[PDB]
Design a protein around this ligand. Structure first.
Ligand SMILES: Cc1cn(-c2nc(Nc3cc(C)c(OS(C)(=O)=O)c(C)c3)ncc2F)cc1CN1CC[C@@H](O)C1
Length: 262
């Protein structure tokens, strides 16, 4: 899995510091995005690569390899159009049917992840990357964890720098991360998509979002969001873990609705 540094060329300017690059492979170059590291975070990057190395699915960013040089580097295949949230921000003309296509692709990628017993733990519109306007891939496995064969959740030790606004109550309250908690994040991700990349819980601190959810409150329907997609978000935001759907159920619902609407 070890790549040759002389064969890698990075553009100066950064697109957690990611740069564009070109890496000569065989007879041709391949365009790449490289995660570059800046003395225990070494292991974290290699853990991330170890996860990516075990995943093979159309809707997941493929790792090319690792490069020990200079800084430690994680080389990935380039998705030109970039993050979903910023793309939809700058392309308000994108049609709901196209957003359904995209979020459904994310659900297939997440279904695969659930079947593989990996938890992403950072599912958000910022970590969905567009290869084309009709092709999305899940990125950023820096927080991901492989589940044990005998357990359906990962238990964190303490509360680090966490994207609180994408996290289910059980994550915040018990540090328990399952595929079901990824479903909650997927709900927030859907909200983001149909709001054309608006931030969720705008202006609210994490503590206030947690209190809002604890009162049985949820985010509103985005302007022009298909009712069936809003209803799916609310299902993703089921408080009780056991009654919240897994990704198979979520993917099925999205697929049937996508196929029926196109
Ligand atoms: C780990 C990682 C992989 N990638 C990857 N990123 C791309 N394409 C791409 C393309 C562009 C034009 C970008 O910049 S941007 C803000 O859209 O102007 C960015 C940030 C990424 N391809 C493959 C990857 F593997 C990005 C990241 C960093 N993530 C953290 C913030 C999230 O937006 C993306």
């Amino acid at each position: 899995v070890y790549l040759d540094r002389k064969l890698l060329t990075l553009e100066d300017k950064e697109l957690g510091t990611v740069k564009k690059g070109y890496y000569q492979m065989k007879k041709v170059v391949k365009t790449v995005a490289v995660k570059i590291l800046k003395p225990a975070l070494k292991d974290e990057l290699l853990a991330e690569a170890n996860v990516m190395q075990q995943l093979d699915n159309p809707y997941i960013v493929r790792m090319i390899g690792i490069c020990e040089a200079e800084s430690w580097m994680l080389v990935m295949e380039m998705a030109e159009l970039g993050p979903l949230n910023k793309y939809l921000q700058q392309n308000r003309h994108v049609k709901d049917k196209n957003i359904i296509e995209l979020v459904h692709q994310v659900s297939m990628g997440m279904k695969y992840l659930e079947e593989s017993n990996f938890v992403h733990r950072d599912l958000a519109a910022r970590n969905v990357l567009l290869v084309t306007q009709h092709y999305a891939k899940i990125s950023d496995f820096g927080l991901s964890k492989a589940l044990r064969a005998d357990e359906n959740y990962y238990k964190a030790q303490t509360h680090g720098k966490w994207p609180v606004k994408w996290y289910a109550p059980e994550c915040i309250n018990y540090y328990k991360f399952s595929s079901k908690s990824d479903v909650w994040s997927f709900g927030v991700l859907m909200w983001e998509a149909f709001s054309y990349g608006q931030k969720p819980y705008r202006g609210m601190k994490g503590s206030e979002v947690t209190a809002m959810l604890e009162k049985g409150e949820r985010m509103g329907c985005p302007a022009g969001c298909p009712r069936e997609m809003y209803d799916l978000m609310n299902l993703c935001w089921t408080y009780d873990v056991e009654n919240r759907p897994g990704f198979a159920a979520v993917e099925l619902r999205l697929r049937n609705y996508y196929y029926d609407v196109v």
